[PDB]
């Protein structure tokens, strides 16, 4: 049986403030820039539709230097931090970014048509761009988040598999890391393994996995450590309706239509796909630059940061403007030529985080020791995530008890 | 005279929690995939615009194993379950799906025109796609739902009927089953019997019946067993305005126009039809992933699940993204060819259900026995739906009295 943390955790009246100064990231919005001979990255990939996972490290309160010590007994008490307030400051102006493919697989525009496509070609690919759906989300926890996507499965060995067959599909749960791609209006699938022509989705997702958070599995966890708080807001609509070009994997049944003649002797493509569009960004619909108070979590864990560790996941596509840069090769010409200038694309992104923490103490009795050991063995030993990449935040040297000297501390003292 | 269940049913203070783990369905969005020689289905049809009817089976509380028994007298008491809270968890990201026909009967675009169509052809069919209207609905009851549609009637035998005559129309009430089609913006009619050219509506409804729930008949039922609770939300608008091609069944009267000459010697088609469009999906307009509390039903039945049976009907077109898959036939070519790849379409859909139930007891006196026998004869015998198809849910082995160990039980205990 799982019990709430409010039973075996005692909260004191000591509060601390923590915060980062400013985080910046500048890079190419579509692909990394790499040296031709080498494999070392010169310009990383920074996009507005990437998961931002911050892993925050806290001081050990047992070894922390407090002006007063009489409030607890080190012989039978142990200390831990609790989160009571978070703000995610978000710079840059509001904007919308677009992406596309120079060789995207589009056959025809089927929204309105007046002639029939009676002849097939060798290459019908086009240069198409669009803007993605609108999404904001924030997740806070003490364990890394969990996402889901569609991937290939293991086929049965009863019958053989011929080239060109439909791959089998299964649903896969993984851990979201820093730099992953969010859904853009095409689904949560592995585009590298489920698409072979490399020309069906834009350039920044054509060789990546799009993942969606697994809210149902996260909230059903018995201990509720992976999610203390979450906000989400997403929207989209359809702008264009197209076809796809290729060979027909599955034929239309003969009892759904009447055969034609002349131009309509053969059938056109039935692999319709839409073009997504986020509508419009406004200041009134923003979930950032606002303080969140963590009064009572939904799960049994109520903001206790076991292991001196915090995880913050952020997605915000409402500031995704890409900047165009131009450099002149030769300036000794008074008439414009296309070949005298070079074009570049850049994206910059700005972050700020600030937190209010409360000090708690735990009495280690035999029953409490047994329960905590059953919950997590490493906690007692201290008194794994080495193959994942997160944005590391080190707050071991940024705490202050002067709570009213900071913007978030003033609000915290004002609400109470 | 019909009396409320609150008079002859006594409620105890015992609550139980039930829930399914996860339900998945993957298939083709338009038609089933079948072997050519055989008639057995390989890939079923899974679409975002299908009725989902879950038939849920509960344990018999008379034979159920309770830790305590003294709260009722088996010599004169009988037990039954009552529903007090339901949540329908809904996975996958928000999206919009589209559908169309490769040989759809469209003549001209009449929104804006500059030339007159003075010549008729043999085949003027086009490849047209669109996106449907937006609809969400949830219905809960203890009997299967009832729907209505337009169908053919029996003509009078006074005069003969010639080929090409207009079929007679009547309104027909039936039972909604799992896999039926919801209205998409073209009406609630039988497209198989009322349309003969097979080219007027897209491929996933051209040989199906679209049904609409019969709310007026459901709420007028004397006992109110078919509907305890319901939510609905639908919206659409018009994108395109077209004509139809064919022979004219009914001529325009000569007193509504002045005859033309030259290009306008004959009249163009007056069988105008619009193209529907659901507008836009947002997180703020969602009715799912929210708990429903059944405090007081509208009808006389107040959540009592007679016969240990429940029915849940769900429609949700706000997650209807179709995934495109591509398979390579030969990989020994460095230049792209259309004939070297095969294209497929898939749709996957995810469900979760969770319920809170209360235990009730009934005293069987002579008047109560007579009333219940008049209401339903099978109830006394226990102390029909074999020709319908539902998604069967078996909760006979998933109850637990530990109510706070689950996400919905925590909310239930929090609200009270």
């Amino acid at each position, epitope marked *: 049986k799982v019990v709430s943390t409010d039973e075996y955790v005692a909260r004191t009246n000591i509060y601390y403030h923590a915060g980062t100064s400013r985080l910046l990231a500048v890079g190419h919005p579509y692909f990394p820039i790499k040296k031709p001979n080498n494999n070392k990255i010169l310009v990383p990939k920074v996009s507005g539709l990437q998961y931002r996972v911050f892993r925050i490290h806290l001081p050990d309160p047992n070894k922390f230097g407090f002006p007063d010590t009489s409030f607890y007994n080190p012989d039978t008490q142990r200390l831990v931090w609790a989160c009571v307030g978070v703000e995610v400051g978000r710079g840059q102006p509001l904007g919308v970014g677009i992406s596309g493919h120079p060789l995207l697989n589009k056959l025809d525009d089927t929204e309105n048509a007046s002639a029939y496509a009676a002849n*097939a070609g060798v290459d019908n690919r086009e240069c198409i761009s669009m803007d993605y759906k609108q999404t904001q989300l924030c997740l806070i926890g003490c364990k890394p988040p969990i996402g889901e996507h569609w991937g290939k499965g293991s086929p049965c060995t009863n019958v053989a598999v011929n*080239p060109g067959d439909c791959p089998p599909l299964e649903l896969i749960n993984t851990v979201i890391q820093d730099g992953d791609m969010v859904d853009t209006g095409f689904g949560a699938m592995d585009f590298t393994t489920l698409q072979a022509n490399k020309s069906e989705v834009p350039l920044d997702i054509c060789t990546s996995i799009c993942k969606y958070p697994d809210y149902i599995k996260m909230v059903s966890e018995p201990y509720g450590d992976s999610l203390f708080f979450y906000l989400r807001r997403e929207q989209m609509f359809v702008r264009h309706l197209f076809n796809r070009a290729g060979a027909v994997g*599955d034929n239309v049944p003969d009892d759904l239509y009447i055969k034609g*003649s002349g131009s309509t*002797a053969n059938l056109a493509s039935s692999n319709y796909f839409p073009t997504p569009s986020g509508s419009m960004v406004t200041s009134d619909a923003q979930i950032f630059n606002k303080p969140y108070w963590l009064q009572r979590a939904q799960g049994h864990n109520n903001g206790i940061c076991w292991g001196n560790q915090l995880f913050v996941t952020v997605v915000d596509t409402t500031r995704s403007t890409n900047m165009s840069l131009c450099a002149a090769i030769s300036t000794s010409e008074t008439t414009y030529k296309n070949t005298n200038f070079k074009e570049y694309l850049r994206h910059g992104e700005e972050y700020d985080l600030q937190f209010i923490f409360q000090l708690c103490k735990i009495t280690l009795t035999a029953d409490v020791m047994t329960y905590i050991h059953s919950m997590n063995s490493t906690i007692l030993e201290d008194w794994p995530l080495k193959k994942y990449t997160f944005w590391e935040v080190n707050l071991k040297e940024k705490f202050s008890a002067d709570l009213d000297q900071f913007p978030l501390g003033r609000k915290f003292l004002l609400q109470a | 005279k019909v009396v409320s269940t609150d008079e002859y049913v006594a409620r105890t203070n015992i609550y139980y929690h039930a829930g399914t783990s996860r339900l998945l369905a993957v298939g083709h969005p338009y038609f089933p995939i079948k072997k050519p020689n055989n008639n057995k289905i390989l890939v079923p049809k899974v679409s975002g615009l299908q009725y989902r009817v879950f038939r849920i089976h509960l344990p018999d509380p008379n034979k159920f194993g309770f830790p305590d028994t003294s709260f009722y007298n088996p010599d004169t008491q009988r037990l039954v379950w009552a529903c007090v809270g339901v949540e329908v968890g809904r996975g996958q990201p928000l999206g919009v799906g589209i559908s169309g026909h490769p040989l759809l009967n469209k003549l001209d675009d009449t929104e804006n025109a500059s030339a007159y169509a003075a010549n008729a052809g043999v085949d003027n069919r086009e490849c047209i796609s669109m996106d449907y209207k937006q609809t969400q609905l949830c219905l809960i009851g203890c009997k299967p739902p009832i729907g209505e549609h337009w169908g053919k009637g029996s003509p009078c035998t006074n005069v003969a009927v010639n080929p090409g005559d207009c079929p007679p129309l009547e309104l027909i009430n039936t039972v909604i089953q799992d896999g039926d089609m919801v209205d998409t913006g073209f009406g609630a009619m039988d497209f198989t019997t009322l349309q003969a050219n097979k080219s007027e509506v897209p491929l996933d409804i051209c040989t199906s019946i679209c049904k609409y729930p019969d709310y007026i008949k459901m709420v007028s039922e004397p006992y109110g067993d078919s509907l305890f609770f319901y939510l609905r939300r639908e919206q659409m608008f018009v994108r395109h305005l077209f004509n139809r091609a064919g022979a004219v069944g009914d001529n325009v009267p000569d007193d509504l126009y002045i005859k033309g000459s030259g290009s306008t010697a004959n009249l163009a088609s007056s069988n105008y039809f619009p193209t529907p469009s659901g507008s836009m999906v947002t997180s703020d307009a969602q009715i799912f992933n929210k708990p429903y509390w059944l405090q007081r039903a509208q009808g006389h039945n107040n959540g009592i699940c007679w016969g240990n049976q429940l029915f849940v009907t769900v429609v949700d077109t706000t997650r209807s993204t179709n995934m495109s898959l591509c398979a390579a036939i*030969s990989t020994s070519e460095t230049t792209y060819k259309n*004939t*070297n790849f095969k294209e497929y379409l898939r749709h996957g859909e995810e469900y979760d259900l969770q319920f809170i139930f209360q235990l009730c007891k009934i005293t069987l006196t002579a008047d109560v026995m007579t009333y219940i026998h008049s209401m339903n004869s099978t109830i006394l015998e226990d102390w029909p739906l074999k020709k319908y198809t539902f998604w069967e849910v078996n909760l006979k082995e998933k109850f637990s009295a530990d109510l706070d160990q689950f996400p919905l039980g925590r909310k239930f205990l929090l609200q009270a």
Partner: antibody
Amino acid sequence: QVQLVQSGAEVKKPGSSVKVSCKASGGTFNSYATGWVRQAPGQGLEWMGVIVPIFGTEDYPQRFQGRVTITADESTATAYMELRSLRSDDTAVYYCARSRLGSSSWFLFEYWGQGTLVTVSS
Amino acid sequence: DIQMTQSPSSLSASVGDRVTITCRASDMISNYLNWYQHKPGEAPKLLIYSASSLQTGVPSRFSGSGSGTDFTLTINNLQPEDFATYYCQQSYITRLSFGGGTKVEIK
């Protein structure tokens, strides 16, 4: 240029099934539409079936439905024709006709096989 | 399907003459007609497609014309290598069909 090569002569008994192949040898083909024709002793030409893998087309004449199957393999660029329930009137010479992608229509059958003799007798 | 009738079924000509063959369709098939030449011991060979267009590598002495239900093939200045069997073919529907065939012989 490209040449289509067919399999050898076949001798079958009534009630059996036969299968004939058609392979493109020179260059790279990238076939467009495949069809089969036959000629009986002392008769004309008879169309027996067409497949167009793009557009997903597969059509046979009414007198031949249920007994004829036409298949194409793009990895090896080989066409196959299957006849079931052979009769004594199926003794004939069979021709493979194919069209190449990049032409102006699907019915520009400019490539033909040499023909295969099939004799159904006991 | 569509039935096609080819006339005549046989004719004799001399070197340097003009030969015309008429072809008739059971329905309107626009210009979806092709003409094939067949010699003994060889495969059929395409000459005219779409009832007017001339295949590459074919002498200009061959011509074809027609539309609707009536079509015709003309050969001017007959040469010794032109003596073969000629067939119609409709491609209006995906269920193609051939004509009866006309055999040209030596006078």
